[PDB]
Design a binder for this molecule. Structure first.
Ligand code: FTA
Ligand code: FTA
Length: 263
């Protein structure tokens, strides 16, 4: 609804940054609303959903098993690895690693899983092969969050990301088992999900993955709807802001309030 585009432009004014925004009907894929749909923004940890989509595609093809145990060492740990740093001794299964990557944004889990699929080049190839010709992963955690201005490494476009997430959650790319697991991991997000669930009306469904990078970069991808069922995908990215979190969070509050008011 254009009143939500007003809030998006309000956010650009107040944040001093570019905001990219899409609402997509989950059933048809129709763009309901867009702002900078085909500009590039760093994905940050929102890529971890696409990563686990590629992992589940391999599980579906018998190329991977969710219960396969992965071992690793102290020198593999990168910044912000709250789950993996506790299983050097135990190791973790593929399923636990996707859970940690998606619900806790665990960076080492993401890097372990990237290795399993062939690295950033193969994630990019997976995306291209499902019709996303622009989303690209180039680097590993934590460098892929660098967000250098004008750098196209590790970026998506809001519209491509929205279309890609709809395909993963509801298209024929993944089996029913896999598409349900992917959305279940997103529904269990511990980072942004509890805040969004609190803010939405009672009983709403939300499944999401957020990300944060350098240089003010932030983003969220989400499937949400009333009455316990998702019916829309919403993608928001921003980069370039020097605002703190107070001002940033007031801005998303305003966009989200409008999205719901005009649903
Ligand atoms: N201020 C401002 C900006 C607004 N852009 C924008 C882009 C698309 C729309 N689209 C729109 C569609 C229906 C009703 C009303 C509006 C509305 C606003 C802007 N700044 N830089 N690029 N766009
Ligand atoms: N504070 C505050 C408010 C923010 N609430 C709100 C409402 C809906 C959302 N939901 C949301 C979902 C996806 C992307 C972005 C946001 C997020 C926040 C508010 N003011 N009036 N109504 N809600």
């Amino acid at each position: 609804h254009p009143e939500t585009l007003v809030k998006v432009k309000d956010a650009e004014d107040q944040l001093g940054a570019r905001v990219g925004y899409i609402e997509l009907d989950l059933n048809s894929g129709k763009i309901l609303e867009s702002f900078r749909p085909e500009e590039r923004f760093p994905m940050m940890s929102t890529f971890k959903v696409l990563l686990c989509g590629a992992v589940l595609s391999r599980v579906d093809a018998g190329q991977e098993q969710l219960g396969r145990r992965i071992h690793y060492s102290q020198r593999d740990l990168v910044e912000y690895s709250p789950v993996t740093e506790k299983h050097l001794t135990d190791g973790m299964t593929v399923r636990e690693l996707c859970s940690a990557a998606i619900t806790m944004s665990d960076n080492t889990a993401a890097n372990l899983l990237l290795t399993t699929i062939g690295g950033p080049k193969e994630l990019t190839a997976f995306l291209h092969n499902m019709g996303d010709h622009v989303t690209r992963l180039d680097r590993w955690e934590p460098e892929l969050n660098e967000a250098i201005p004008n750098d196209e490494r590790d970026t998506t476009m809001p519209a491509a990301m929205a279309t890609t997430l709809r395909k993963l959650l509801t298209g024929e790319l993944l089996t029913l088992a896999s598409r349900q697991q992917l959305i279940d991991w997103m529904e269990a997000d511990k980072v942004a999900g509890p805040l969004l669930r609190s803010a939405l009306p009672a009983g709403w469904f939300i499944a999401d993955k957020s990300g944060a990078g350098e240089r003010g970069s932030r983003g969220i991808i989400a499937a949400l709807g009333p009455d316990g069922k998702p019916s829309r995908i919403v993608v928001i990215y921003t980069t370039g802001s020097q605002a703190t979190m107070d001002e940033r969070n007031r801005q998303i509050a305003e966009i989200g309030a409008s999205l719901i008011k005009h649903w």
